[PDB]
Amino acid sequence: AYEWGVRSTRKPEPPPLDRVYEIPGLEPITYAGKMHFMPGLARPVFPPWDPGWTHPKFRRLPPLHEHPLYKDQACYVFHQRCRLLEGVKQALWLTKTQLIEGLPEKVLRLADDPRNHIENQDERVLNAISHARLWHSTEDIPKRETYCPVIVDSLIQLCKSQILKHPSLARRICAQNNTLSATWNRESILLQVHGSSGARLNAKDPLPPVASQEEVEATKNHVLETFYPISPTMGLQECNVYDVNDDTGFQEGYPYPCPHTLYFLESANLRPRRFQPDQLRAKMILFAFGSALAQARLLYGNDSKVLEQPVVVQSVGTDGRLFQFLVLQLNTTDLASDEGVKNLAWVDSDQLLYQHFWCLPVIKKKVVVEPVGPIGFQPETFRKFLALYLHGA
Amino acid sequence: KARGNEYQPSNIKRKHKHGWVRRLRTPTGVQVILRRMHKGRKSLSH
Amino acid sequence: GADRMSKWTSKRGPRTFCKGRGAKGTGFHGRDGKFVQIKEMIPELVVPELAGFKLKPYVNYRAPEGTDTPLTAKQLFLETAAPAIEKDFKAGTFDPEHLEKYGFEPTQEGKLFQLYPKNFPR
Amino acid sequence: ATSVSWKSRTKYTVMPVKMRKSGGRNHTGQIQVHGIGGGHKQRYRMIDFLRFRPEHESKPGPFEEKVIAVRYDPCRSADIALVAGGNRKRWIIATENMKAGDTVLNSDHIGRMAVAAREGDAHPLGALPVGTLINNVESEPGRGAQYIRAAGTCGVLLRKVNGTAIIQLPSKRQMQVLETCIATVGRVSNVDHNKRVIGKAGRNRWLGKRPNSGLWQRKGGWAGRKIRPLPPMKSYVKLP
Amino acid sequence: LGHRYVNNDKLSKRVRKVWKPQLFQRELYSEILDKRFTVTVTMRTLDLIDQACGFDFYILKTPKEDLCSKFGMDLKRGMLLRLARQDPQLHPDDPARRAAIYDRYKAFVIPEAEAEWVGLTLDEAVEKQRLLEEKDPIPLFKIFVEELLGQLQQQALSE
RNA sequence: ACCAAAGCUAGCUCAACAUACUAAACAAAUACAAAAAUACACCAAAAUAAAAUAAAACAUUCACCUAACAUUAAAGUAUAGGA
RNA sequence: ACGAGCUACCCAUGAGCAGUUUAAAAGAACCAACUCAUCUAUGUGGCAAAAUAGUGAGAAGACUUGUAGGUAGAGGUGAAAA
RNA sequence: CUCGCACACGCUUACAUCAGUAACUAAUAAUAUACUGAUAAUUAACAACCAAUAAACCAAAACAACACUAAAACGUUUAUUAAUUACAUUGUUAACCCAACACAGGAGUGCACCAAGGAAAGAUUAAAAGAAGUAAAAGGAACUCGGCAAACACAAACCCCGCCUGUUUACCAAAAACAUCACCUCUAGCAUUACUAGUAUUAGAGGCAAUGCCUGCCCAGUGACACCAGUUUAACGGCCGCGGUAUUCUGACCGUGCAAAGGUAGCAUAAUCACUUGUUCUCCAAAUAAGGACUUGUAUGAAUGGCCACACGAGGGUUUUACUGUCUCUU
RNA sequence: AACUAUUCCAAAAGUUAAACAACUAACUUAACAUGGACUAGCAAUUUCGGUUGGGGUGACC
Ligand SMILES: [Mg+2]
Ligand SMILES: [Mg+2]
Ligand SMILES: [Mg+2]
Ligand SMILES: [Mg+2]
Ligand SMILES: [Mg+2]
Ligand SMILES: [Mg+2]
Ligand SMILES: [Mg+2]
Ligand SMILES: [Mg+2]
Ligand SMILES: [Mg+2]
Ligand SMILES: [Mg+2]
Ligand SMILES: [Mg+2]
Ligand SMILES: [Mg+2]
Ligand SMILES: [Mg+2]
Ligand SMILES: [Mg+2]
Ligand SMILES: [Mg+2]
Ligand SMILES: [Mg+2]
Ligand SMILES: [Mg+2]
Ligand SMILES: [Mg+2]
Ligand SMILES: [Mg+2]
Ligand SMILES: [Mg+2]
Ligand SMILES: [Mg+2]
Ligand SMILES: [Mg+2]
Ligand SMILES: [Mg+2]
Ligand SMILES: [Mg+2]
Ligand SMILES: [Mg+2]
Ligand SMILES: [Mg+2]
Ligand SMILES: [Mg+2]
Ligand SMILES: [Mg+2]
Ligand SMILES: [Mg+2]
Ligand SMILES: [Mg+2]
Ligand SMILES: [Mg+2]
Ligand SMILES: [Mg+2]
Ligand SMILES: [Mg+2]
Ligand SMILES: [Mg+2]
Ligand SMILES: [Mg+2]
Ligand SMILES: [Mg+2]
Ligand SMILES: [Mg+2]
Ligand SMILES: [Mg+2]
Ligand SMILES: [Mg+2]
Ligand SMILES: [Mg+2]
Ligand SMILES: [Mg+2]
Ligand SMILES: [Mg+2]
Ligand SMILES: [Mg+2]
Ligand SMILES: [Mg+2]
Ligand SMILES: [Mg+2]
Ligand SMILES: [Mg+2]
Ligand SMILES: [Mg+2]
Ligand SMILES: [Mg+2]
Ligand SMILES: [Mg+2]
Ligand SMILES: [Mg+2]
Ligand SMILES: [Mg+2]
Ligand SMILES: [Mg+2]
Ligand SMILES: [Mg+2]
Ligand SMILES: [Mg+2]
Ligand SMILES: [Mg+2]
Ligand SMILES: [Mg+2]
Ligand SMILES: [Mg+2]
Ligand SMILES: [Mg+2]
Ligand SMILES: [Mg+2]
Ligand SMILES: [Mg+2]
Ligand SMILES: [Mg+2]
Ligand SMILES: [Mg+2]
Ligand SMILES: [Mg+2]
Ligand SMILES: [Mg+2]
Ligand SMILES: [Mg+2]
Ligand SMILES: [Mg+2]
Ligand SMILES: [Mg+2]
Ligand SMILES: [Mg+2]
């Protein structure tokens, strides 16, 4: 095998001990007396140093096994930044879930009713895009780190403007950065989705289940696809210190108990520091699922059972030019077995809000060919966005 | 082209090349300091 | 040819060179990068109430000086420990083992202001 | 003075790690090798050259891995492949037709019947047919591949005698090894690397090659066309 | 270190030359210290050990100048100490072996005050002597108390 | 008549003696980029002196040339040397 | 012993390159900043121990350039001009 | 008339206010940013200082949609611990630095082309010669080593040498020298500091100079392999005569000597010892110039490369136009 | 000479037979590594006799 250090680098082996230390029954004479190095004298050996009072900062790092929460069962954790190798496949398998192409038809009907549009949709949304992508900064060409959260929030505002027409929307509150811990056991593998998502829309009243019983029973016969060489745990964090407790980021008696929509931004300048669209889909599957599972174990409890009352959660995600829509229905708290009823997920993937954007007029042979602004605009994707925002009322 | 401007001042370079620490890090440097001390120089080093 | 003679001061180098003028550090660098002061490192001035007390910055001229005797460890021994030791040897209660009642201290590490490693500034 | 090599990183990573070129200079700072320096900036991908490497010591058996992607590598001539199995990924040197979304077997197991050889497969030499094409050849068993890693190169297994394999290196020299040593089956990636045409001196500079010297040296005795009988066979088999 | 003439003709070039000893790795057994040291020695060292009939003999039987090694002098200091002490820890289980061994070397036995100073560099010596002289200066309270007790006991005995 | 001129001191030199041989001054700061009170280490080491020159060149050789033993003689003797 | 703060070549780490022409940032083209130093005239104790004026060559590259580091004289460095 | 404001690096009070300047600095004064004295001054929000250990991440910057090849600087999150408590410390002037000078030189970046900065002339006179400019009758290279310089011109052709962009003698040479893509020889079977975290389609030591047609004969010498035989010239290097013959000059043929082979293809009065201003044709009124042929060059010649060629060249030569104070011949 | 590689002898560590014929020798060698040789590389030290109708060539001594 080829070992990966290099001798030159690895901290130098201690100097060969002085010859006077091999002679039995003889006290070597050292410079230890004079408190400094001297040539001609033997090198003193000192006891590992114990400053009888311990200092919080300058002490050695406590070994991991000493912690009260240490356990010998390796628990695989999924946090906000983990990438899954096979994204949606893995997500589904860990979640025990079937995938469905479009969005639920409830949501689409909500989307295609001309009653549900804003005053001028094309106008306002073209403006939201242009604002986010250009106008919101002093600089010529804003980076993504700014313009992704800006555009998501612009759209949230455009939808929030409908609180006038359907005044049930005030039953919601928005939250940022909550600790979420969902532990569950799947096929002898222990999984925990643990961490923070970016932004979370919570509601006072839960969301009506979107799948007819025919779907749920057609779920009973569906076989989970499997990737043989790759273990399903791939890309997670092997972790030996963890807590198993159901934790939604809020304590008891929270006035807005029901997770409604989760928002996942990819705001990073470099490509390699963002998620592949697929991996992102996986991320929101797992996290939506965790958010659901927490609740499901709050209103029912740790016992593993099929659910008489499904829990529904939504998720949206972004490049800032590209959107991922997801609706998840949780039907099952027993994931140990592979053979039962499976949870449901609808994923509308790779929905372009606009094709491209020009921040400076593009000029060819001293004429203006392409003006400043967005190229191509899909009112459809914003319509779906609105739909998901309006799912409560 | 034109010469004589060979000296382009930097304090970091100055003190890394000619400084006290640099003179004490090698036996030869120490002999420099010793010679200057002997001659009674006002400034032993930069 | 730069400057050899003039002393090396924070004013002289690049941005990266900051050398204090010799004031003493009051703290450390914290988590936020912001600086944290430690209330214990900041010297607390101990100032007596001067109002009701009579002494002045100068002395009357007709007031005499005196024969100058530098205080010695001996004189200090005799003004303090000698009367007590003599009193307790004359009564035979003298104990060469424990001198602590006379004010001798075997080791300094217990007390707040120690003399030999000199724990206090002033 | 003294410089420290960039080559210290203890843990294996599939992620590209940053490296410092040193044009021809040893750690003392003098030129050792002439004609090297200042190419494009390069990150380094760690290659696992031990093809058979059981993930956990718990299950020793022959295992199987999936090929995820086949990428260009700046550091070597061959193209490399990202290969994942169990919980782990690693870079391996890609065989000629290896493509993404593929399956590759790693096995230490011998048997009387040999094996039908696919490309990415790694087997002990003893397990292969006697005419097979191999690359990434170990010397002693467990050591890791050294020989035949360059782009488009292939050796060939010649024969099997006395619990030992004799193979033919790309230089057409013969090499004798224990038959317990692993090798990968096929020709290495990027076979046309031979026919690439550097267009201009500039490109050579991009590759980090500084021009030859200008001094004129009269050719000596060493030059000419020497025809030498092919050298005797190297044997890493240690006789008792 | 020296020079030579090439060909040994005095009329040829004169050339710097250095003659280096041939060194070997050999492990030697000390009886008195009961140990095997791995030491670099010459063929000459082995011949002198042979000639003096024991490793421990050779070390005890040779003067400081002839060994030339600081390690030789420390070996010697060690087993000289073990002889002057009659250290029981030599062979803890068998006083038979112990007396048997301490027997043959009885010619070299030297007192203890001498035995710990044998192999010492002037540096090590100065250090050792500095440590034996190490004292925390006596508090003036003590000294003044003793002067006062002297004076009080001579004031009590005079009446 | 300008420019100028004249001093006799500052100190030095060489020896003698001599105890014995790193002066004086240290409050803080000084081996971070010396003079910057305060954080887990590393630290350290040795190898023949050479040549200019003399030999009317230069090739073996070439006193003294940073190794205590002085003085009167033996004696520029025995010896050594491209003798 | 001391020198790579000039310069030769490296290593790290930053920074520049507008307009025009082209499917093209192609060691292409025109031409600034920038870098060089062709030819001439001045100058020749000079503004200058190598410059000034005009004129020229390159100008997304084997390009220019800042900062810190390296290699040392029996050596270094060198697209050889000793 | 236009090199301005700021920061970095550097400099170190040269800055500011009041006063003084007989003399000292300013290459001279007036007076004063630079001489002298006294007294003051730059205040942190900017800048410096400003956590470690594990773990998940194969997926460039280029308006980044997506790609190109030379494969690319720049971080999130999760876990484990991180003294917890107003005000810490330090840089903050300038007309400035490196060039012995208050030097027409050298100096990184961001913004500007003016709103900011500045003054070519101490006063005269209007000689020569010198410098820098503008104009010029008729002519238009007759100048001269050369159209050097100049010009109301800013075009065309042909050779030589190098393929090309590039590099070089800082301060007399920028080139035909070097490098270079390409093509060829040699040397290596391999592991933790170079080569290389590479493995013969690789890496070193060299030659030669892209492409195209080619690269002839020689291993006797000298090398180097093979420790001797033997092998090697894209290793160092070499590649011939005398006599007689077709009526006549020549010599297919003949004789014979010597060599390891006897200079092959090509090209040729050449950047090629001399003879040489070879001979002839073209160009000019006239040419030792230029170009084309002939050509034993008895001293050309094939990777110390030979021959053609595209494009390129501040390389070296030649012609035409045009342009002109180069010149007639100066003003 | 040193140094860098080659080759060899000795040093050092070993290993074998109890050798052969009739009525002591031989062989082995991982990295270091010593003494003495060998062949090369890379080098080190030193020198350019005089006369001459100026030197050089030729000639001479
Ligand atoms: Mg100078
Ligand atoms: Mg100076
Ligand atoms: Mg500073
Ligand atoms: Mg500064
Ligand atoms: Mg603070
Ligand atoms: Mg490489
Ligand atoms: Mg490659
Ligand atoms: Mg080459
Ligand atoms: Mg060359
Ligand atoms: Mg002489
Ligand atoms: Mg003389
Ligand atoms: Mg001489
Ligand atoms: Mg001498
Ligand atoms: Mg003799
Ligand atoms: Mg430098
Ligand atoms: Mg441009
Ligand atoms: Mg160009
Ligand atoms: Mg100019
Ligand atoms: Mg002009
Ligand atoms: Mg110009
Ligand atoms: Mg140009
Ligand atoms: Mg051009
Ligand atoms: Mg340096
Ligand atoms: Mg020399
Ligand atoms: Mg040299
Ligand atoms: Mg160069
Ligand atoms: Mg030359
Ligand atoms: Mg020359
Ligand atoms: Mg100055
Ligand atoms: Mg002033
Ligand atoms: Mg004046
Ligand atoms: Mg300022
Ligand atoms: Mg004037
Ligand atoms: Mg005039
Ligand atoms: Mg004129
Ligand atoms: Mg004119
Ligand atoms: Mg005219
Ligand atoms: Mg003419
Ligand atoms: Mg004429
Ligand atoms: Mg001209
Ligand atoms: Mg012209
Ligand atoms: Mg013209
Ligand atoms: Mg050229
Ligand atoms: Mg020059
Ligand atoms: Mg130059
Ligand atoms: Mg040029
Ligand atoms: Mg020039
Ligand atoms: Mg050339
Ligand atoms: Mg060819
Ligand atoms: Mg050619
Ligand atoms: Mg040939
Ligand atoms: Mg031969
Ligand atoms: Mg031969
Ligand atoms: Mg011809
Ligand atoms: Mg000729
Ligand atoms: Mg010839
Ligand atoms: Mg040749
Ligand atoms: Mg030739
Ligand atoms: Mg071309
Ligand atoms: Mg030309
Ligand atoms: Mg050029
Ligand atoms: Mg040119
Ligand atoms: Mg000599
Ligand atoms: Mg002569
Ligand atoms: Mg002469
Ligand atoms: Mg003559
Ligand atoms: Mg004459
Ligand atoms: Mg002669």
Short mmCIF file of C-alpha atoms in Angstrom, two decimals, chain E residues 10-156:
data_model
loop_
_atom_site.label_atom_id
_atom_site.label_comp_id
_atom_site.label_asym_id
_atom_site.label_seq_id
_atom_site.Cartn_x
_atom_site.Cartn_y
_atom_site.Cartn_z
CA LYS E 10 59.04 11.73 -1.80
CA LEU E 11 59.23 13.46 -5.17
CA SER E 12 55.60 12.88 -6.14
CA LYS E 13 52.52 14.98 -5.29
CA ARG E 14 51.70 15.52 -1.66
CA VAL E 15 48.09 14.88 -0.89
CA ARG E 16 45.68 15.16 2.03
CA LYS E 17 44.47 11.76 3.25
CA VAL E 18 42.33 10.54 6.11
CA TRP E 19 42.39 7.03 7.53
CA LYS E 20 39.05 5.94 9.02
CA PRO E 21 38.55 2.93 11.36
CA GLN E 22 36.28 0.06 10.23
CA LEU E 23 33.17 0.12 12.43
CA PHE E 24 30.83 -2.68 13.42
CA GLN E 25 27.49 -3.10 15.07
CA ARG E 26 27.90 -5.59 17.90
CA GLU E 27 25.83 -6.30 20.99
CA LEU E 28 27.84 -6.87 24.16
CA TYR E 29 26.80 -8.41 27.47
CA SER E 30 27.66 -6.76 30.77
CA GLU E 31 27.52 -9.12 33.76
CA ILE E 32 27.52 -6.55 36.50
CA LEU E 33 24.93 -4.30 34.86
CA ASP E 34 23.16 -7.42 33.53
CA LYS E 35 22.38 -5.98 30.13
CA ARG E 36 22.97 -6.24 26.39
CA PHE E 37 24.03 -2.98 24.79
CA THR E 38 24.13 -2.53 21.02
CA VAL E 39 27.39 -0.69 20.49
CA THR E 40 29.50 0.39 17.55
CA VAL E 41 32.92 -1.08 18.14
CA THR E 42 36.11 -1.75 16.26
CA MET E 43 37.94 -5.01 15.76
CA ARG E 44 40.51 -3.56 18.13
CA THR E 45 37.91 -3.17 20.86
CA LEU E 46 36.89 -6.81 20.47
CA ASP E 47 40.53 -7.88 20.64
CA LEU E 48 41.07 -5.87 23.83
CA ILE E 49 37.93 -7.36 25.36
CA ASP E 50 39.23 -10.81 24.40
CA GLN E 51 42.63 -9.98 25.87
CA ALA E 52 41.23 -8.69 29.17
CA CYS E 53 38.95 -11.77 29.26
CA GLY E 54 35.65 -9.98 29.84
CA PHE E 55 33.58 -7.04 28.69
CA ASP E 56 33.23 -5.84 32.26
CA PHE E 57 36.88 -6.58 32.87
CA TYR E 58 37.92 -4.55 29.85
CA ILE E 59 35.84 -1.62 31.05
CA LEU E 60 37.10 -1.75 34.63
CA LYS E 61 40.67 -2.69 33.76
CA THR E 62 41.43 0.15 31.34
CA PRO E 63 42.31 3.79 32.14
CA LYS E 64 40.25 6.78 31.01
CA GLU E 65 42.72 7.71 28.27
CA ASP E 66 42.68 4.27 26.61
CA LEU E 67 38.88 3.85 26.24
CA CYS E 68 38.42 7.38 24.89
CA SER E 69 34.64 7.15 25.08
CA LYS E 70 32.33 9.09 27.37
CA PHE E 71 30.07 6.03 27.14
CA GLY E 72 32.90 3.80 28.31
CA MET E 73 33.41 6.05 31.31
CA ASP E 74 29.68 5.95 32.05
CA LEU E 75 29.58 2.15 31.80
CA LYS E 76 32.51 2.11 34.20
CA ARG E 77 30.90 4.62 36.57
CA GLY E 78 27.77 2.50 36.59
CA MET E 79 29.33 -0.87 37.41
CA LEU E 80 31.82 0.76 39.81
CA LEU E 81 28.79 2.10 41.65
CA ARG E 82 27.13 -1.32 41.54
CA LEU E 83 30.29 -2.83 43.09
CA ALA E 84 30.83 -0.24 45.86
CA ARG E 85 27.11 -0.40 46.76
CA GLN E 86 26.80 -4.18 46.45
CA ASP E 87 23.43 -3.32 44.94
CA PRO E 88 20.88 -6.09 45.66
CA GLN E 89 18.87 -5.22 42.54
CA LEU E 90 21.54 -6.84 40.36
CA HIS E 91 20.00 -10.30 40.63
CA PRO E 92 16.98 -9.94 42.97
CA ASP E 93 16.09 -13.67 43.09
CA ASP E 94 19.52 -15.35 43.40
CA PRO E 95 22.02 -14.09 46.00
CA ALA E 96 24.17 -17.04 44.83
CA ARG E 97 24.75 -15.55 41.38
CA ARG E 98 25.08 -12.12 43.00
CA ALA E 99 27.88 -13.06 45.39
CA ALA E 100 29.49 -15.18 42.65
CA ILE E 101 29.68 -12.20 40.30
CA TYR E 102 30.62 -9.57 42.88
CA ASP E 103 33.40 -11.99 43.78
CA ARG E 104 35.60 -11.96 40.66
CA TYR E 105 35.61 -8.17 40.40
CA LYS E 106 36.64 -7.55 44.03
CA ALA E 107 39.99 -6.15 42.90
CA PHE E 108 38.46 -2.98 41.47
CA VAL E 109 36.17 -2.13 44.39
CA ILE E 110 36.60 1.49 45.40
CA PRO E 111 34.75 3.53 48.06
CA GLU E 112 31.40 5.24 47.33
CA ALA E 113 32.46 8.90 47.46
CA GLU E 114 34.98 8.06 44.76
CA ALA E 115 32.78 5.83 42.63
CA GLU E 116 30.19 8.40 41.62
CA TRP E 117 32.76 10.93 40.40
CA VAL E 118 34.74 8.64 38.08
CA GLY E 119 33.32 9.16 34.60
CA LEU E 120 32.50 12.84 34.86
CA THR E 121 33.11 15.69 32.45
CA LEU E 122 34.14 18.96 34.09
CA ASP E 123 30.67 20.22 33.13
CA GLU E 124 28.76 17.38 34.75
CA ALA E 125 31.01 17.66 37.79
CA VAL E 126 30.46 21.39 38.22
CA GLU E 127 26.72 20.83 37.86
CA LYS E 128 26.65 18.01 40.43
CA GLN E 129 28.64 20.04 42.94
CA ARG E 130 26.33 22.99 42.33
CA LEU E 131 23.32 20.79 43.15
CA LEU E 132 24.83 19.46 46.38
CA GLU E 133 25.44 23.07 47.42
CA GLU E 134 21.89 24.10 46.58
CA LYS E 135 20.27 25.89 49.52
CA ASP E 136 17.52 28.47 49.95
CA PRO E 137 19.08 31.38 51.88
CA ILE E 138 18.11 31.24 55.55
CA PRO E 139 15.50 33.80 56.69
CA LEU E 140 16.97 36.56 58.89
CA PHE E 141 14.25 35.84 61.45
CA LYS E 142 15.98 32.53 62.28
CA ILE E 143 19.47 34.02 62.64
CA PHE E 144 18.20 36.96 64.71
CA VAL E 145 16.22 34.57 66.95
CA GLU E 146 19.39 32.53 67.61
CA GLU E 147 21.46 35.63 68.45
CA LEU E 148 18.67 36.71 70.81
CA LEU E 149 18.52 33.29 72.52
CA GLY E 150 22.30 33.38 72.93
CA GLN E 151 22.06 36.80 74.58
CA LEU E 152 19.09 35.82 76.80
CA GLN E 153 20.77 32.58 77.97
CA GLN E 154 23.91 34.55 78.82
CA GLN E 155 21.79 37.13 80.68
CA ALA E 156 20.14 34.29 82.65
#
